[PDB]
């Protein structure tokens, strides 16, 4: 007669169970029929950090299926713009043509994909509606004003290294209005595309189309969008007297804060969230009996890091909206019968 | 609208309305698993399970077997609605939290 409703207990030789006991018929009284108000009451979102290119909200009180749906949407279904076709007029570089096209596909563009649309199948030409064109034209020459020196930038250098700065947007249609001068640009100005020697030249036109990270990774808008369940650490016994420090070393260092309540030293669990699961207490043989570390049941921690095309919060919003769009597409196709 | 990027339903042996297999095209484990979680909350369904037919293909099979009365197409169309309601609520809550944090940080 003992219920544990909220934690995923764990030892070393394996974890105890894979359930969450929050579904219909999963208890004598604790049965579920998807009370929507109970959800709307027990749900809360909390954001730990929001630099540019980072977010760490909490998303407390949701199941693993919905959290995983959100994570898989950000990685593979939120749309981005990226180079699909490369027209090469001349290329006397050491970098091949196909390898140059590949390298150009993996460069992130700062166009927001919500103002564009998908190119129809076999729309090779493209129009202001679905495409953005950029041009890289660079040639390397020796600089006339150079002494007998060997630094590659000083001599043998007008364009020794071709960067993303060298790529220039060719406004395709009326896109010069709508897009102000600096808005459509590659996100990073320092990505090394190639290297040149005097007499070598690159000249090409790149076409960027819309797409999702599912049919090619180049179109994916986040470095990673993973999540982790909130750890839980409980001191079953008061640790003290120089075993507190050994305890504080078997964890990521901020988790067990050793206070000094009396002349003796007491270890306390200051911040369970910092913990990385390393299970190094389980090697102690005397303190594996003192601490129980498990996971909180439906308390997640998310971390979204965008490449630079869209801000992270906008990414999460568009992910939730993409899931809603899936649901609505299937609802309206069902209503079609 | 789309004759086959979307739904194809196969009523079972005897065309039992209470046992249907929906084929959802262009879907992977994301919608499959979230929708199966949302359809399991209905006490009127006795068996819900999804599965991907083959890696090379892009389509899932849901199987809903409901109790004696309802035609097993209401559980599906209600799991969809509840999942979309949950997504709308999560979106509202997340945007409100982001706004509140932006204000708290821009003030200080």
């Amino acid at each position: 007669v003992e219920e544990m409703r909220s934690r995923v207990v764990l030892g070393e030789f394996g974890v105890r169970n894979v359930h969450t006991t929050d579904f219909p018929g999963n208890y004598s009284g604790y049965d579920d029929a998807w009370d929507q108000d109970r959800f709307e009451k027990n749900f809360r979102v909390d954001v730990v950090h929001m630099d540019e290119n980072s977010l760490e909200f909490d998303m407390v009180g949701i199941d693993a299926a919905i959290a995983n749906a959100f994570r898989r949407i950000l990685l593979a279904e939120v749309p981005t713009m990226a180079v699909e076709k490369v027209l090469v007029y001349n290329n006397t570089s050491i970098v091949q043509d196909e390898i140059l096209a590949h390298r150009l596909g993996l460069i992130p563009i700062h166009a927001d994909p919500r103002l564009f649309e998908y190119r129809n199948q076999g729309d090779e030409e493209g129009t202001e509606i679905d495409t953005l064109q950029f041009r890289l034209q660079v040639r390397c020459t020796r600089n006339p004003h150079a002494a007998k020196d060997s630094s590659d930038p000083n001599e043998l250098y007008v364009n020794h290294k071709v960067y993303t700065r060298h790529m220039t947007w060719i406004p395709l249609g009326n896109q010069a209005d709508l897009f102000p001068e600096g808005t459509i640009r590659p996100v990073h100005d320092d990505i090394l595309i190639a290297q040149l020697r005097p007499g070598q030249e690159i000249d090409l036109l790149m076409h960027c189309v819309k797409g999702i990270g599912k049919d090619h990774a180049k179109f994916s808008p986040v470095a990673t969008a993973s999540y982790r369940l909130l750890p839980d650490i409980t001191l079953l016994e008061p640790v003290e007297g120089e075993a507190a420090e050994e305890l504080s070393r078997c964890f990521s260092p901020g988790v067990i804060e050793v206070q000094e309540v009396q002349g003796k030293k007491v270890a306390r669990v200051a911040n369970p969230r910092l913990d990385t699961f390393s299970r190094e207490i389980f090697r102690n043989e005397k303190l594996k009996k003192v601490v129980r570390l498990a996971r909180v049941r439906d308390h997640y921690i998310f971390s979204v890091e965008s490449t630079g095309v869209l801000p992270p919060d906008v990414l999460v919003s568009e992910a939730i909206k993409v899931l809603m769009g899936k649901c609505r597409r299937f609802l309206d196709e069902l209503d079609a019968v | 609208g789309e004759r086959k990027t979307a739904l194809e339903m196969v009523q079972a042996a005897g065309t039992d309305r209470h046992c249907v297999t929906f084929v959802l095209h262009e879907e992977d484990h994301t919608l499959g698993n979230s929708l199966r979680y949302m359809i399991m909350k209905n006490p009127e369904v006795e068996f819900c399970g999804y599965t991907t037919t083959h890696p090379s293909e892009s389509k899932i099979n849901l199987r809903i077997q409901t109790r004696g009365t309802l035609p097993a197409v209401e559980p599906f169309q209600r799991g969809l609605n509840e999942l979309m309601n949950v997504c709308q609520h999560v979106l509202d809550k997340f945007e409100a939290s982001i706004k509140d944090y932006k204000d708290q940080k821009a003030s200080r």
């Binding site: 954001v47 730990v48 909490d58 | 708290q104």
Partner: peptide, 5 residues
């Protein structure tokens, strides 16, 4: 580290 203060 710790949701917003």
């Amino acid at each position: 580290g710790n949701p917003p203060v």
